[PDB]
Design an enzyme around this catalytic site. Structure first.
Site, PDB file in Angstrom:
ATOM      1  CG  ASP A 181      -2.309  -0.625   0.987  1.00 34.60           C
ATOM      2  OD1 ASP A 181      -2.536  -1.322  -0.034  1.00 34.60           O
ATOM      3  OD2 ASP A 181      -3.188  -0.443   1.866  1.00 34.60           O
ATOM      4  CB  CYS A 215      -1.250   0.998 -11.424  1.00 34.53           C
ATOM      5  SG  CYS A 215      -0.426   2.484 -12.202  1.00 34.53           S
ATOM      6  NE  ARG A 221       1.298   0.398  -6.866  1.00 38.28           N
ATOM      7  CZ  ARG A 221       0.329   0.040  -6.024  1.00 38.28           C
ATOM      8  NH1 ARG A 221      -0.520  -0.928  -6.359  1.00 38.28           N
ATOM      9  NH2 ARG A 221       0.209   0.659  -4.845  1.00 38.28           N
ATOM     10  CB  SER A 222       1.462   1.593 -15.444  1.00 37.18           C
ATOM     11  OG  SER A 222       0.219   1.050 -14.992  1.00 37.18           O
ATOM     12  CD  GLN A 262       2.087   7.886  -9.580  1.00 32.53           C
ATOM     13  OE1 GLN A 262       1.968   6.695  -9.263  1.00 32.53           O
ATOM     14  NE2 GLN A 262       1.127   8.765  -9.387  1.00 32.53           N
TER      15      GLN A 262
END
Ligand SMILES: COC(=O)c1ccccc1Oc1ccc(N)cc1
EC number: 3.1.3.48
Length: 282
Positions: A181, A215, A221-222, A262
């Protein structure tokens, strides 16, 4: 510089935030006018994440052709990817329309439906064989065929039927279920194992349309997934693998979708994954 020793040099000097901010400063800025039209407000999950006009995927529809999705075309590596946001309640039918029209074989999902106590994406695939889904706005039917649950990820076989023509196709759903998370994984071993399973399926290969990867926003994440894949492929193709420059590859990918990777922690994790992955390849 090479990668593994540039890596130790940034760790010892603690300058990951400065490296990452340089990338942000140099990244391309292209217009995203279609994304910002008022009629498309409920087609975007986040107001600050939009596809560029020049690389956006168009739906084959004359009313409204918009979806928050971008074509990332990597010329030297000979690999294409579609990066998209997690589908919204009012875009699940558009999502499967895109999969159909672009001839994709695989969908790669890097998030859980609920994370941090909030919904990160709609439940857009069926959970039981006998309870199929019909998307009436785009005239598609989706059936769960089989499911294989492993410790770090799940693979599903799905059948997508175009109800207008009665044609059917098999789609593979690759779901990475264990990204934490907060932060990034401590070791890249399970993420690389997952990447290799997607590769082995044929979903990334030129005989199919581009893989669809998402994502929640489709950039973090992508971005890590496609950046690691492309860097490892270039290391196999070139005479000199130490010439692969991960920062330059990332800036090339950011010509096609804003914001890829990110955080500085995601940047460091991408380096780690490519470094460890290059040892296993040989
Ligand atoms: C239930 O889903 C499956 O397990 C499955 C079914 C049909 C076709 C492919 C499948 O996934 C894979 C199998 C093996 C490797 N190596 C990668 C992907």
């Amino acid at each position: 510089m090479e990668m593994e020793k540039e890596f130790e040099q940034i760790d010892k000097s603690g300058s990951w935030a400065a490296i990452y901010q340089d990338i942000r400063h140099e990244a391309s800025d292209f217009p995203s006018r279609v994304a910002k039209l008022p009629k498309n407000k409920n087609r975007n999950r986040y107001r600050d994440v939009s596809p560029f006009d020049h690389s956006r995927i168009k739906l084959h529809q004359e009313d409204n052709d918009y979806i928050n999705a971008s074509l990332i075309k990597m010329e030297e590596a000979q690999r294409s990817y579609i990066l998209t946001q997690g589908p919204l309640p009012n875009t699940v039918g558009h999502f499967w329309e895109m999969v159909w029209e672009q001839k994709s074989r695989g969908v790669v999902m890097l998030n859980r439906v609920m994370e941090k106590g909030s919904l990160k994406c709609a439940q857009y695939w069926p959970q039981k064989e006998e309870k199929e889904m019909i998307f009436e706005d785009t005239n598609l039917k989706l059936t769960l065929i089989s499911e294989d649950i492993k410790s770090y990820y799940t693979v599903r076989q799905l059948e997508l039927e175009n109800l207008t023509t009665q044609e059917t196709r098999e789609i593979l759903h690759f779901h990475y279920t264990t990204w934490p998370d907060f932060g990034v994984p401590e070791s890249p071993a399970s993420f690389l194992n997952f990447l290799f399973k997607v590769r082995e399926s044929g979903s990334l290969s030129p005989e199919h349309g581009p893989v669809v990867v998402h994502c929640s926003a489709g950039i973090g994440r992508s971005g890590t997934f496609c950046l690691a894949d492309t860097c490892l492929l270039l290391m196999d193709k070139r005479k000199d693998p130490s010439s692969v420059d991960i920062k330059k590859v990332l800036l090339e990918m950011r010509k096609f979708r804003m914001g890829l990777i990110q955080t500085a922690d995601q940047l460091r994790f991408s380096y780690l994954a490519v470094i460890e992955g290059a040892k296993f390849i040989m």
